[PDB]
Design a protein around this ligand. Sequence first.
Ligand SMILES: Nc1ncnc2c1ncn2[C@@H]1O[C@H](COP(=O)(O)OP(=O)(O)OP(=O)(O)O)[C@@H](O)[C@H]1O
Length: 284
Amino acid sequence: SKRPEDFKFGKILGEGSFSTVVLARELATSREYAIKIVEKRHVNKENKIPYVQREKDVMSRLDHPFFVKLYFCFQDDEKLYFGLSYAKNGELLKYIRKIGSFDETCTRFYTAEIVSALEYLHGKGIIHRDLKPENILLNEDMHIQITDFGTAKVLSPESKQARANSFVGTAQYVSPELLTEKSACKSSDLWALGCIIYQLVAGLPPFRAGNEGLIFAKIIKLEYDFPEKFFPKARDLVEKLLVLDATKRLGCEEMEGYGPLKAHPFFESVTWENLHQQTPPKLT
Ligand SMILES: Nc1ncnc2c1ncn2[C@@H]1O[C@H](COP(=O)(O)OP(=O)(O)OP(=O)(O)O)[C@@H](O)[C@H]1O
């Protein structure tokens, strides 16, 4: 229903091999959107149509403050256009790099937002499979906006599906079960969460190397260490997430879900109910 001429495009916000995200203003309303533009020729010439379809279908299911929102879709002869919420403050990763690591209050706040987001996503039967700081954006108010759903999976409720078979992810955050059993589950995202918490505190993710195979070897052996100063209750939480057996990670269905995870001592001072309306702590 909307058309390209309905917008004025400004700066490019990001580029992929077959997508470009542009900041746009809608003329009839003056609203700002990040519009993801997919060139049909390239996605066709690379057989990536399924990735585009997956991102659309998954995002259309999401209606929660901690996720990028898909507002509209349209196309023309050359391009698909997806109108998304604009996360003005960019990637969480940028802040980890700039400040080196997060203090305890900021680690707690942003970890709690990620946990709240995963609770919602997993409650909808969706696995992200590529959770990482690059994919956790920050809005103008400094709340999280999780993105990148082309490699997410909607588990079928009709078959009570628990495992997903596509090999997707990012080496530093990929779960041991995907490497060894060749499938992922919702608890695979809790493994990524453990890696992210570790990275917020220590400044680097826990399994790291200059070659992906080396990372895989350490993941499957649970070969990592904590720096000498690491907030102790955060270390305990990481140790309860970075567990090789995906049925034994705090937050997973076999461990009775998000209640016990939200009850962890690292979160004692968190008020879970209105996180998105709280003022985030300043990052410095
Ligand atoms: N909703 C948004 N608000 C602000 N910036 C965004 C938004 N969505 C994406 N970007 C920026 O655009 C860039 C590309 O995102 P896009 O979804 O086009 O591809 P990608 O998934 O990052 O690339 P690839 O598919 O190759 O992994 C990212 O660097 C991201 O920071």
